[PDB]
């Protein structure tokens, strides 16, 4: 018995959720995964802790999915970030909410998430065959044939959830784009998004340090969020978002305290004209950031003159950084681009050109910010694709 109602290709967050919803709707379901493990990429989101969704409202979500979020109104009315939170709560996983509405398991371990998903697939009788790479997908009359090098399976409904093109060592190497092409869909241009930034800058002084809520500016686009200093330059949300507007050759500007304007700072110093300038700023900033700003200046806040005060403050508020480029698609967190949404039903996620065929997750031309919006996007679209609609 190799024939199923539904076959789902790719066991990421989209694939797992379609397997759950399809089974739940009485569909006899097969999930195929190329790796020995499910959720290889998912296991590494949120610094490996697993950033499973975001707890904001609908507008927070739309602001979180800049790349074609508007297509998801229909999907989100069926299953949303709060349906996700319910599911994991219902099934005995303790979630928690961190900054910017990011949702993690209390365990801080991605296996708590993936293991819960596998457990449900099993309670619902879903079939999963791992360590199996699909190489071929055809359709005859009303019957999809799905083939690996060894075997073949059949179905009437086919869900393709093979992901994007970034981090191909997770398994997302584009096969779902080939399917889409084979059945004569348009695949848009595939390019990097949420790609960390290469800077020309003394990286050693600051790498590993994290900063909460800072403003990076460049031309019209100005962004206020979290930032990580890396050995190659800049990552974390702020860098990641800005990375869409920048290619290499630009100067961008960093505001390390968007809270205080020039004057508040000036006043703050006078209150601590007794401590060392490093120690002064050590109270407002992480220590290694303090070192960085105040190395070239006099030891003590009072030893400063007027011109030193004004120059220092302008560095604190407007440090110019030189960007020499960004990471490629391969090394970016998100693929901007995918299967074209003008040929997909926004409500069922069925292809408009081939009946029975469906697409969910990153394989579609949807792209979002890190912070749970991609994963939320994949679980939901997955849920919908796997679910049944009739009329």
Ligand X SMILES: Cc1cc2nc3c(=O)[nH]c(=O)nc-3n(C[C@H](O)[C@H](O)[C@H](O)COP(=O)(O)OP(=O)(O)OC[C@H]3O[C@@H](n4cnc5c(N)ncnc54)[C@H](O)[C@@H]3O)c2cc1C
35 binds ligand X, rule: CB under 6 A? yes
Q: How many residues touch ligand X (CB under 6 A)? A: 42
Q: What value does the CA radius of gyration of the chain take, rounded to a whole number of Å? A: 24
Q: Which position among 8, 20, 31, 32 is part of the footprint of ligand X (CB under 6 A)? A: 32
Q: Which tokens hold the place of 196?
A: 């960390």
Piece of 92-100, 209-217, 374-382, 383-391 that binds ligand X (CB under 6 A) = 374-382
Piece of 35-43, 86-94, 265-273, 304-312 that binds ligand X (CB under 6 A) = 35-43
Q: Is 179 annotated for ligand binding?
A: no
Q: Is 385 annotated for ligand binding?
A: no
- What is the DSSP-derived secondary structure letter of residue 45? T
Q: Tokens 């080939």 — which residue?
A: 178
CB-CB contact of 372 with 6 (8 Å): no
CB-CB contact of 214 with 254 (8 Å): yes
Please list the residues that pair with 104 across neighbouring strands: 96
Q: Which residue in 177, 159, 163 sits closest to 7, CA to CA? A: 159
Piece of 9-17, 299-307, 321-329, 342-350 that binds ligand X (CB under 6 A) = 9-17
- Alpha carbons 187 and 138: distance in angstroms, whole number: 18
Q: Which position among 378, 380, 384, 385 is part of the footprint of ligand X (CB under 6 A)? A: 378
- What is the DSSP-derived secondary structure letter of residue 251? E
Output 330 or 353, the one with its CB closest to ligand X: 330
Backbone torsions φ then ψ of 300, nearest 5 degrees: -110, 140
Q: Which tokens hold the place of 126?
A: 């879903």
Q: Is 375 annotated for ligand binding?
A: yes
Q: How many CB atoms lie within 10 A of CB 83?
A: 15
- Alpha carbons 349 and 170: distance in angstroms, whole number: 24
Q: Which residue in 197, 228, 233 sits closest to 212, CA to CA? A: 228
Q: Is 123 annotated for ligand binding?
A: no
Q: Is 14 annotated for ligand binding?
A: yes
Output 34 or 317, the one with its CB closest to ligand X: 34
10 binds ligand X, rule: CB under 6 A? yes
Q: Which position among 81, 110, 112, 374 is part of the footprint of ligand X (CB under 6 A)? A: 374
Q: Is 33 annotated for ligand binding?
A: yes
Contacts with ligand X in 40-59 (CB under 6 A)?
A: 40-42, 44-46, 51
Q: Which residue in 15, 83, 92 sits closest to 55, CA to CA? A: 83
**Which residues form the interface with ligand X (CB under 6 A)?**
9-15, 32-35, 40-42, 44-46, 51, 133-134, 161-163, 166-167, 170-172, 175, 333-334, 361-363, 368, 370-375, 378
Residues placed in the known binding site: 14, 33, 134, 362, 374-375
**Residues of the binding site for FAD:** 14, 33, 134, 362, 374-375
């Amino acid at each position: 018995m190799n024939h199923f109602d539904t076959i789902i290709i790719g066991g990421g967050p989209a694939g797992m959720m379609a397997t759950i919803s399809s089974s739940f709707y009485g569909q006899k379901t097969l999930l195929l995964e190329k790796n020995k493990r499910l959720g290889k990429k998912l296991a590494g989101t949120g610094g490996g802790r697993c950033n499973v969704t975001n707890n904001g409202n609908l507008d927070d979500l739309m602001a979180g999915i800049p790349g074609n979020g508007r297509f998801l109104y229909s999907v989100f009315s069926q299953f949303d970030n709060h349906d996700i939170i319910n599911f994991f709560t219902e099934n005995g996983v303790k979630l928690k909410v961190e900054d910017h509405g990011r949702v993690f398991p209390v365990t801080d371990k991605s296996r708590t998430i993936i293991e819960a998903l596998e457990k449900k697939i099993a309670e619902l009788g879903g079939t999963v065959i791992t360590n199996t790479e699909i190489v071929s997908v055809k359709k005859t009359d009303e019957l999809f044939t799905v083939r690996s090098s060894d075997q073949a399976w059949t179905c009437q409904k086919l869900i393709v959830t093979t992901g994007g093109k970034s981090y191909p060592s997770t398994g997302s190497t584009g096969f779902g784009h080939d399917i889409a092409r084979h059945f004569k869909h348009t695949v848009t241009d595939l390019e990097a998004a949420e790609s960390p930034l290469l800077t020309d800058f003394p990286h050693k002084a600051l790498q590993g340090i994290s900063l909460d809520d800072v403003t990076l500016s460049y031309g019209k686009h100005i962004i206020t969020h979290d930032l990580l200093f890396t050995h190659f330059g800049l990552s974390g949300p702020a860098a990641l978002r800005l990375s869409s507007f920048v290619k290499g050759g630009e100067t961008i500007y960093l505001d390390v305290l968007p809270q205080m304007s020039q004057q508040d700072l000036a006043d703050f110093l006078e209150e601590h004209r007794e401590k060392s300038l490093k120690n002064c700023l050590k109270i407002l900033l992480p220590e290694r950031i303090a070192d960085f700003f105040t190395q070239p200046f006099p030891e003590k806040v009072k030893q400063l003159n007027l011109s030193e005060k004004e120059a220092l403050i302008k560095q604190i508020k407007e440090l110019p950084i030189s960007v020499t480029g960004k990471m490629s698609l391969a090394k970016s967190f998100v693929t901007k681009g995918g299967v074209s949404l003008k040929e997909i039903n926004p409500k069922t996620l069925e292809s408009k050109l081939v009946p029975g065929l469906h697409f969910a997750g990153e394989v579609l031309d949807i792209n979002a910010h890190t912070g749970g919006f991609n994963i939320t996007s994949a679980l939901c679209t997955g849920w919908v694709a796997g679910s049944l609609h009739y009329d």
